[PDB]
Design a protein around this ligand. Sequence first.
Ligand code: NXB
Lengths: 236, 197
Amino acid sequence: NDYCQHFVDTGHRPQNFIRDVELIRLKDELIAKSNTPPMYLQADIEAFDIRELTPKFDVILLEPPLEEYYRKCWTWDDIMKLEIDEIAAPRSFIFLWCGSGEGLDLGRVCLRKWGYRRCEDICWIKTNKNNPLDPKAVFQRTKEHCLMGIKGTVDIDLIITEEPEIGNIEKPVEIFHIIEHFCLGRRRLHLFGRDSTIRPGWLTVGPTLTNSNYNAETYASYFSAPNSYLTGCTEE
Amino acid sequence: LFPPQWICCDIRYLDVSILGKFAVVMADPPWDIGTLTDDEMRRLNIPVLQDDGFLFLWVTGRAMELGRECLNLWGYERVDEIIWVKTNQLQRIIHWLNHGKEHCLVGVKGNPQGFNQGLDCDVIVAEVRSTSHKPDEIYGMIERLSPGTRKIELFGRPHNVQPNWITLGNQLDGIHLLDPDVVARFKQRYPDGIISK
Ligand SMILES: Nc1ncnc2c1ncn2C[C@H]1OC[C@@H](N)[C@@H](O)[C@H]1O
């Protein structure tokens, strides 16, 4: 059958009809034991010299609040001016939420500006099983992109969930599972996270956080020798 | 005009200006990731094919970036991005991550009028077939977007030929042209056939 046609007929997005979405849990349990305690800092990132966030990170998850999520917001002008290369480790990874509009282009510019090359394009595909427009848009937009960048030298590149309630800007927690299953290192930064996103193994920084516990000397102590080079998937 | 038409050619060397203007261009190029170098891709004479319309550009790997480059070089702005979720017959999905999709950049040129923007959504769910064979659903999406207008496909194979479409590719069988304005300009430009150099 033609699900494109079906969507025109009924309003059920084609992804509504995708189906089905052995000790790969021991990997998850190693992640859990290696995880640092959750750390978090309230900071207005427009006004905040990010160089105060130390040491340099192995993974950066960047989730700037785009205007299009809502139907202060950061524009791609603002985002491109973040000095992400000043806190990234020489070999490190970025996951940048780009939305579905011009961000798919301007996010690639950001990645190259900060010194990465895009190695994956992860799409969050939103179903509307429970509920059967940009002026430049040619099609109804039913997904978002999270770009993965790499600098220096099990999962699939799709997340499928139901479209969240209007006004809900959360991204699927599956993005964390994908990032953590890569075993990229233990210094993990989430910029523009919220109270709702704080998580073991992660440093969360955002303007809406209600509480802070970040201390740079304490944070670094989690990675002092003999723990400087752990993958995040090893025994403690 | 209406029925399928095609030209076996080397797209690098055909004088595409005999074909006229098209509401839609679609291409599935042999990116260098029988391929074309990045300069040959950049040099392709896409700009003459359209005045106001849309371009559909299949990309994988580093062509996700290079295709954006060609897109802009040829004079398009990328305004959408179709994702084809690849499934089997049971509607289940088929370096760092395994790939469940392929991307089709959508560019706009000029100011198109009379198109039905917003009828379809930017996700396709369709079975995998032979390799490099894109799903037929795209022709339905494109027809509903721009019904009855002239369309051109670059790097198509015999199964890609469709009504309202002119298909170009080097694995087509011969030259099948029906539009009088096209056969006219083809005879003038190519009085003996032959599309070399
Ligand atoms: N210089 C050229 N001129 C015309 N067609 C050409 C070409 N190089 C390759 N192709 C055809 C290829 O298109 C890409 C892909 N869909 C394959 O299936 C194959 O057909």
